[PDB]
Chains A and B, each alone.
Chain A
């Protein structure tokens, strides 16, 4: 099924021609557009008062990365390198070795935030919910160097944001 968008022929009756002439000479449709703009002037604007008001977000939102840990304080990451393998931008660099207690842990976990595309593939590849994408998005920087995160920065981000991260994961994990 199809429709014609512009296939109407104007009436030739004196009345139709006079109406078209009145439109041409008196600018009726221009006045109609002016009235539309006038009506729009008198309705409440859609502006919010940033930063005192914020934009609504979802528990699924992808923001700044963080490394998490178990309630005992032991870190969840066991250096499987699945996030490094899946990263489309090759933004994760991992080095691991046995710990002093024989535990399988990382000695290097770097994320280059200027290569990252914030796709969230790493957190869905993780088998132990170690690397996550947090809710924070206000982390602009004055230099390029501070956007190259090492393991200490990501652990500090986890310790900073764990409350919100845990609440969001509780809200959304039944869809995963």
Chain B
């Protein structure tokens, strides 16, 4: 989800953009500014929350040895969902 600066530059996923008074913008004249269009935060925000009938779930990111280190997530808190510290996937117990 890319945005645009008030000047006209694209804003990166890190939020970078030269301000109006910055001379460094001159590096982009007659050229382009390399920006990745796929924002990881928005892409991980679209994944559905998985439902599991257990208090503790395990996540390795999918693909077994091709994922991340296997971690265990506690789902006792009903206020929020459990989130993997590597992948960003979310888990919850079936409330109601």
Partner-B contacts on A (CB < 8 A): 69-76, 78, 99-101, 103-105, 107-108, 127-129, 150-153, 155-156, 159, 169-170, 173
Contacts and interface: CB of A to CB of B under 8 A. Distances in A.
A73 B86 contact: no
A73 B1 CA distance: 13
A99 B87 contact: no
Interface residues of B, number: 24
A76 B36 contact: no
A155 B65 CA distance: 22
B38 A73 contact: yes
A101 B86 CA distance: 13
B40 interface: yes
B29 interface: no
Interface of B: 12, 14, 34-36, 38, 40-41, 43-45, 47, 61-62, 65-69, 85-89
Given A73-B43, A101-B44, A101-B45, 10 more contacts: A72-B43, A72-B47, A72-B87, A105-B40, A107-B14, A155-B36, A155-B38, A159-B38, A169-B66, A173-B66
Contacts of A129: 66
Contacts of A101: 41, 44-45
B87 A70 contact: yes
Contacts of A150: 34
Contact of B36 (A72, A104, A107, A156): A156
Contact of A128 (B36, B40, B86): B86
Contacts of B36: 151-152, 155-156, 159
